[PDB]
Coordinates of C-alpha atoms in Angstrom, one line a residue:
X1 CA -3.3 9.9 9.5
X2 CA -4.8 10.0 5.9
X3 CA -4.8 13.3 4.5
X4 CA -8.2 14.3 4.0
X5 CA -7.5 15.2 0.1
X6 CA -7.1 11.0 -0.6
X7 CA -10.0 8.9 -0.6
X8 CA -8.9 5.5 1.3
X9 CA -8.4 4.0 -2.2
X10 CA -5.9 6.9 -3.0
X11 CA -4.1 6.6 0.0
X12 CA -3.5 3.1 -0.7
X13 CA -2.4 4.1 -4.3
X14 CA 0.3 6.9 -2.7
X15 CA 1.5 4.2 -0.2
X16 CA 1.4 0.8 -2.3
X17 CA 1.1 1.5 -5.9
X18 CA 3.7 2.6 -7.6
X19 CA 4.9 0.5 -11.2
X20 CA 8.5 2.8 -11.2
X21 CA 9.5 3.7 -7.4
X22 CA 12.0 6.1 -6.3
X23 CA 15.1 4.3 -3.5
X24 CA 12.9 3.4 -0.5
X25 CA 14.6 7.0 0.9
X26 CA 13.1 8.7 -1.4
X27 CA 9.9 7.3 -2.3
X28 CA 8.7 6.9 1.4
X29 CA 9.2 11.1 1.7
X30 CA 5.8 11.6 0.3
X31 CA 4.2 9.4 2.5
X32 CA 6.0 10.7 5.5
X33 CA 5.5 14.1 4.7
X34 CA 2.0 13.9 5.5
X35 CA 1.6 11.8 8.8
X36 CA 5.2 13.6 10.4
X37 CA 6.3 10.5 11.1
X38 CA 8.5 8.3 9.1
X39 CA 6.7 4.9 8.6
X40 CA 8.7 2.0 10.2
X41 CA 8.0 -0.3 7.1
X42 CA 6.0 -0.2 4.0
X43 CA 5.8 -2.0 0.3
X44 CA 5.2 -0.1 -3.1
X45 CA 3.7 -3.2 -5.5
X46 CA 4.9 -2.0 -8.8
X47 CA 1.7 -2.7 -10.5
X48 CA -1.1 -0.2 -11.2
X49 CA -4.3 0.3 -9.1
X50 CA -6.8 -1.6 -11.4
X51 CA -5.0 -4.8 -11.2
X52 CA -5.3 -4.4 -7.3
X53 CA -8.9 -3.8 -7.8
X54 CA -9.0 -6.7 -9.6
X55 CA -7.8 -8.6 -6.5
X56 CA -10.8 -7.5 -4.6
X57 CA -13.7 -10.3 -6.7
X58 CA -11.3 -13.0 -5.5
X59 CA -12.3 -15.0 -2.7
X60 CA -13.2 -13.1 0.6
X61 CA -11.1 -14.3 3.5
X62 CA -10.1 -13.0 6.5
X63 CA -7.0 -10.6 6.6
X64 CA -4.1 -12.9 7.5
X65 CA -1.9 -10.0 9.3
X66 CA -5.1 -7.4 10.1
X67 CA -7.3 -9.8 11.7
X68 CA -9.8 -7.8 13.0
X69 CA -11.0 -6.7 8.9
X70 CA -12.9 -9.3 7.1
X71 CA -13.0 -8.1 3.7
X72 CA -9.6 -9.2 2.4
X73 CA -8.8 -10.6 -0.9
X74 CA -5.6 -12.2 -2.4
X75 CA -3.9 -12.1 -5.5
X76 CA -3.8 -14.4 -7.9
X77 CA -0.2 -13.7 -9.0
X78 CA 3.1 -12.7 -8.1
X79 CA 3.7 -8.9 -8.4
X80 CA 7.2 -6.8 -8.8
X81 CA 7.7 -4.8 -5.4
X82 CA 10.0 -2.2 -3.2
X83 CA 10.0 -3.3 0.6
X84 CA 10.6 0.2 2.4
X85 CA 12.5 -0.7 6.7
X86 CA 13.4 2.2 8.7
X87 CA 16.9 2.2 9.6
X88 CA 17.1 5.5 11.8
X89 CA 14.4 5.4 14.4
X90 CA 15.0 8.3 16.3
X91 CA 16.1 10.4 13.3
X92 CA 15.6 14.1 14.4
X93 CA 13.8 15.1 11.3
X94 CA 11.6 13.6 8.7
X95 CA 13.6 14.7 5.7
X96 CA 16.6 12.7 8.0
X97 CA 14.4 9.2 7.9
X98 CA 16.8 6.6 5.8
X99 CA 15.4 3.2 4.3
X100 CA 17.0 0.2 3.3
X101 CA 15.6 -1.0 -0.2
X102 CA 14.5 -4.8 -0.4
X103 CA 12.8 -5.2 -3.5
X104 CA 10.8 -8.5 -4.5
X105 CA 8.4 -10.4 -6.6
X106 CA 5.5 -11.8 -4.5
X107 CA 1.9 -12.1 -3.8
X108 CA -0.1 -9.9 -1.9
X109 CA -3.0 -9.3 -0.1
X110 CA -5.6 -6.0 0.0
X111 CA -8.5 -5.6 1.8
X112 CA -11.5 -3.9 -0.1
X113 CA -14.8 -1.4 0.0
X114 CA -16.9 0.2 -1.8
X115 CA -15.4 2.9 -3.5
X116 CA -15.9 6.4 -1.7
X117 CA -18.1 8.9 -4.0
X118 CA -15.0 10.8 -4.9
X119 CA -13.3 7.5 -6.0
X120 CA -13.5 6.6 -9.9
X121 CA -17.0 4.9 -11.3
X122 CA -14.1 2.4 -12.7
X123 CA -14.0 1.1 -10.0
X124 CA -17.4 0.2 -7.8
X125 CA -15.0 -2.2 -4.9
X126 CA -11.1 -0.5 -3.9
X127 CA -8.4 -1.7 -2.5
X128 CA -7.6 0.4 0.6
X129 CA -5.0 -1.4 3.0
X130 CA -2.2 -3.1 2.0
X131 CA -2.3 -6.1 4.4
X132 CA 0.8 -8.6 3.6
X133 CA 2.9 -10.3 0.6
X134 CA 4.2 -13.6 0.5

């Protein structure tokens, strides 16, 4: 679940932006810490969250993946990124969840709101699901 101390936008940041990632191992521990479960798969673009925002004025479109949201948006351009997989379903403890590292350089493609009130003003539309690269 999201912690209640992250906005959805900041949620998004913890889980997809990160321009210098730790190995997939270690990087996806502050995620998992959270939810007590180790995500099965997850990308860190390695970009910063105001070129993300960016993505949200281009054309509205449908979510490819997500198809029930509406209010996706892809990029323009080809971003450096670490692709997190679970290896170790099953693995008895969180701290014990191991992830092979496929890093990449791709497009992607965010779905957007307004920002919440505890968002910045920098930034009136967020990005606040990660919904596929290509």
């Amino acid at each position: 679940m999201r912690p209640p101390q992250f906005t959805k936008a900041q949620w998004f940041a913890i889980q997809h932006i990160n321009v210098n990632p730790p190995r997939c191992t270690i990087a996806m521990r502050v995620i998992n810490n959270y939810q007590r479960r180790c995500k099965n798969q997850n990308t860190f673009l390695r970009t910063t969250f105001a070129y993300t925002a960016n993505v949200c004025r281009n054309e509205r479109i449908r979510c490819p993946r997500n198809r029930t949201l509406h209010n996706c948006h892809r990029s323009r351009y080809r971003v450096p990124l670490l692709h997190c997989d679970l290896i170790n379903p099953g693995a008895q403890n969180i701290s014990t969840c191991r992830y092979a590292d496929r890093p990449g350089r791709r497009f992607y493609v965010v779905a957007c709101e307004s920002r919440d009130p505890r968002d910045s003003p920098r930034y009136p539309v967020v990005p606040v699901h990660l919904d596929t690269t290509i």
